[PDB]
């Protein structure tokens, strides 16, 4: 398992947690020096448990699919909560077996459904370590509407920061003050699947992408990534979604 405590959290201990989370994810090989996640894992080995502690020392345990870093559900006291999706229901027969009751959330775990449930696009939800502390607190008392918003913060500050160094650094900048995500952060989250696939099929093609990826950079300037030589590939992306799962 991996653990992160918000009491006394600084940019450095957050960094150690994101590092722990990355090499908790199994891989057999690397493509251009970036860990390639497995096509599949059978049984209870498919899931990683993250224990998160808010400032007051309350806790939730979050289950993460190691093949794609998707959050499946979480345990808050004696209640487990799982997204309304086939993947999360498969997950429920392996993790949080000892929960007194299991609730299925009224949405799936994808950004689009989470945003509808929240009443806000993630452009307008501040993120940071303070937000994460809030998110943990919101999740131990069921409320489906607040939970959607708390899950949008949790996903971005854990899973997305693991996938990209840039996003990890964004969250480190927001250690003591929340701020909405930059445009770059959002386009990165949105392009993970696309970038993963183009990096993988660039490898018999001299590092050249079959189809260019369109991103937005820091200054909000539109950019075209065409090959593995770009900074995004050499100095940003930390995990690749296997093309089998794309």
């Amino acid at each position: 398992d991996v653990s992160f405590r918000l009491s006394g959290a600084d940019p450095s201990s957050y960094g150690m947690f994101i590092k722990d989370l990355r090499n908790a994810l199994p891989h057999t090989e690397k493509v251009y020096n970036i860990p390639l996640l497995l096509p599949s894992v059978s049984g209870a080995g498919r899931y990683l448990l993250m224990h998160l502690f808010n400032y007051d020392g309350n806790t939730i345990t979050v289950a993460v699919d190691v093949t794609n870093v998707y959050i499946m559900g979480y345990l808050a006291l004696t209640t487990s909560y799982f997204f309304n999706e086939p993947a999360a229901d498969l997950a429920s027969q392996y993790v949080f077996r000892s929960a007194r009751r299991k609730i299925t959330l009224p949405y799936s775990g994808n950004y689009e459904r989470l945003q509808i449930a929240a009443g806000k696009p993630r452009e307008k939800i501040p993120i940071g370590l303070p937000a994460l502390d809030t998110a943990i607190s919101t999740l131990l008392h069921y409320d489906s509407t607040a939970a959607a918003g708390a899950l949008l913060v949790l996903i971005q500050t854990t899973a997305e920061a693991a996938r990209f160094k840039y996003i990890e650094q964004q969250i480190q900048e927001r250690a003591y003050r929340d701020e909405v995500p930059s445009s770059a952060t959002i386009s990165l989250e949105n392009s993970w699947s696309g970038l993963s696939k183009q990096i993988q099929l660039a490898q018999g093609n001299n590092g050249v992408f079959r189809t260019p990826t369109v991103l937005v950079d820091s200054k909000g300037n539109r950019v075209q990534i065409t090959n593995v030589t770009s900074n995004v590939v050499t100095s940003n992306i930390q995990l690749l979604l296997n093309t089998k799962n794309i």
């Binding site: 840039y166 650094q169 964004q170 900048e173 701020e179 909405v180 995500p181 930059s182 445009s183 770059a184 952060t185 950079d217 820091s218 909000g220 770009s230 900074n231 995004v232 050499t234 100095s235 940003n236």
Partner: peptide, 6 residues
Amino acid sequence: SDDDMG
């Protein structure tokens, strides 16, 4: 690759 805020 880039950084701060937004």
